[PDB]
Design a protein around this ligand. Structure first.
Ligand SMILES: CC(C)=CCC/C(C)=C\CC/C(C)=C\CC/C(C)=C\CC/C(C)=C\CC/C(C)=C\CC/C(C)=C\CC/C(C)=C\COP(=O)(O)OP(=O)(O)O
Length: 373
C-alpha cells in the first residue's frame, strides 16, 4: 500500500521550500515513526534540520496552521480523509512544499489451522470506483465452519463505540470511522473487540454491490415487515420478494422506518448475504467462478488468495450441501454525549456497547469455530 508525508503550509504562504523553515508542527506522539522518516529524508536531500512542535493529532496540526499559530505542518495523506470530516475544504486551504512517498507491506491473509475461518465484509458508503474513500457502514463478520457446514453472521453496528486500531490510535470512536483509515484499521478493530483472528476481508461499495447483484440475476429474500426505501421509490411487501440490484440496494439501506431501526437494517443485510451465498453456490456460478472474478475484480477488493478461492469452489462443486446460517448482532445503548476521536468538535450519535451482549457474541463465534452446539 502507498501513502505520503508532506510538509504543508497555507495556500497563500510566502514559504516555497523546506529550507526556509526552522520548525514544523507534527503529531510525534502518535505518528513518530513516519514523521522521523520524513525528517531524515529532508536532512538527506536538503541538509535542513527542523525542530518539531508536537501537536496532539493531524487534525490539531491542521487547526494550528489555519489559525496562523504555526507556519508549517507535517501531513500524512491517510489523515487527510479524517481532517476532511470537520474541514471539507481543507485541500483548498493548503499547498505542499515537500513530499515523501511511503509503502507499507500488506498484512497477509491468515490461513486457518483448522476447519473454520473468519471473513470480514466491509461495505463502504459511496458510489463510484472502489478506491473511493468513505466510512464503512456495513461491518459483518462471517464465521464459516466447513466441517459442520455452519456459518455465523455477526453484525457490529456502524455506530458501535469501540477502540479504533491503527490510525484510530486505539481511542474510542464509531466503528464506521475505522473504514476511513483503511480496511486494516477496520479488521484490527474487530479482531481486538472480539478476540478473534480475521483470516480474509472483502471490501465493496454501492456501485460494487449493484454490479454484483446484476451479475447474479438479482436475489430472493423473505421480507418480514412492510417498508419502503429511497424516499418511497421502492415498496417491499411482507413475503417472498425478488430484488434486482437497485431494489436490493434500497433494501439494505433503509433503517428509520423499520420497527427495530438499525437492528432490522442489519438483519436485512444478513438476509441479503444469505441470498448472495445461495446464488454464488449454484452449480453454474461455481463452474463459472473465474468469469465472476473477471467481471467484479475491478470493483470488489479482497485478500482471499486465488488458491483459496479455487479450493472453496471446487470442494463445494464436489460435495454440494448448503450451509446452515445463523445471525447475531452486538447490542448497546445510543448516546450523543461521548467524544469522537475523529471528530472531537462534533456531537455524534454512538452506541455504547453492552458488556453482556459482547460476552454472548464472543462465545457464539468461538462455538461455531470449534464446531460446538
Ligand atoms: C461461492 C464461493 C465463492 C465459495 C463457496 C462457499 C464457501 C465455502 C464460503 C463462503 C465464503 C466465500 C469465500 C465467498 C462468498 C462471498 C461472500 C462471503 C459474501 C458475499 C456478500 C458480499 C461481498 C456483500 C454483501 C454486503 C452487503 C449486505 C451490503 C453492502 C452494501 C453497501 C456497500 C453499503 C451499504 C451501506 C449502508 C448500510 C448505509 C449507507 O446508506 P445511508 O442511506 O444510511 O447513508 P448515506 O448514503 O445517506 O450517507
Amino acid at each position: 500500500s502507498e501513502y505520503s508525508l508532506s510538509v504543508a503550509v497555507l495556500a497563500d504562504s510566502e514559504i516555497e521550500n523546506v529550507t526556509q523553515l526552522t520548525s514544523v508542527t507534527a503529531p510525534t506522539g502518535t505518528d513518530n515513526e513516519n514523521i522521523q522518516k520524513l525528517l531524515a529524508d529532508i536532512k538527506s536531500s536538503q541538509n535542513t534540520d527542523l525542530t518539531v512542535n508536537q501537536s496532539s493529532s493531524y487534525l490539531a496540526a491542521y487547526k494550528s496552521l489555519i489559525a496562523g499559530e504555526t507556519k508549517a505542518i507535517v501531513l500524512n495523506s491517510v489523515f487527510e480523509n479524517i481532517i476532511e470530516l470537520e474541514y471539507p475544504d481543507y485541500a483548498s486551504k493548503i499547498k505542499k512544499i515537500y513530499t515523501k512517498g511511503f509503502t507499507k507491506k500488506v498484512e497477509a491473509p491468515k490461513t486457518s489451522k483448522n476447519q473454520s475461518f473468519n471473513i470480514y465484509v466491509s461495505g463502504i458508503d459511496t458510489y463510484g470506483p472502489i478506491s473511493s474513500v468513505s466510512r464503512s457502514d456495513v461491518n459483518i463478520l462471517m464465521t464459516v465452519n466447513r466441517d459442520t457446514k455452519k456459518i455465523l453472521l455477526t453484525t457490529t453496528p456502524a455506530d458501535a463505540y469501540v477502540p479504533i486500531a491503527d490510525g484510530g490510535n486505539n481511542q474510542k470512536d464509531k466503528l464506521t470511522h475505522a473504514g476511513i483509515y483503511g480496511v486494516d484499521s477496520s479488521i484490527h478493530t474487530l479482531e481486538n473487540l472480539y478476540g478473534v483472528d480475521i483470516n480474509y476481508y472483502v471490501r465493496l461499495n454501492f456501485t460494487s454491490f449493484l454490479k454484483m447483484i446484476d451479475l447474479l440475476g438479482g436475489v430472493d429474500v423473505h421480507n418480514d415487515q412492510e417498508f419502503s426505501a429511497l424516499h418511497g421509490k421502492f415498496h417491499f411487501p411482507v413475503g417472498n420478494v425478488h430484488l434486482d440490484s437497485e431494489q436490493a440496494l434500497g433494501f439494505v439501506r433503509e433503517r428509520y422506518s423499520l420497527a427495530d431501526g438499525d437492528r432490522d437494517r442489519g438483519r436485512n443485510q444478513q438476509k441479503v448475504i444469505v441470498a448472495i451465498l445461495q446464488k454464488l453456490t449454484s452449480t453454474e456460478a461455481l463452474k463459472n467462478y473465474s468469469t465472476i472474478i473477471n467481471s467484479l475484480q475491478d470493483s470488489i477488493q479482497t485478500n482471499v488468495p486465488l488458491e483459496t478461492m479455487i479450493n472453496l469452489v471446487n470442494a463445494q462443486l464436489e460435495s454440494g450441501g448448503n450451509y446452515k446460517v445463523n445471525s447475531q448482532d452486538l447490542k448497546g445503548t445510543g448516546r450523543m454525549d461521548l467524544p469522537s476521536y475523529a471528530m472531537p468538535d462534533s456531537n455524534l450519535y454512538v452506541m455504547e456497547i453492552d458488556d453482556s451482549s459482547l460476552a454472548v457474541v464472543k462465545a457464539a463465534i468461538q462455538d461455531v469455530m470449534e464446531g460446538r452446539k
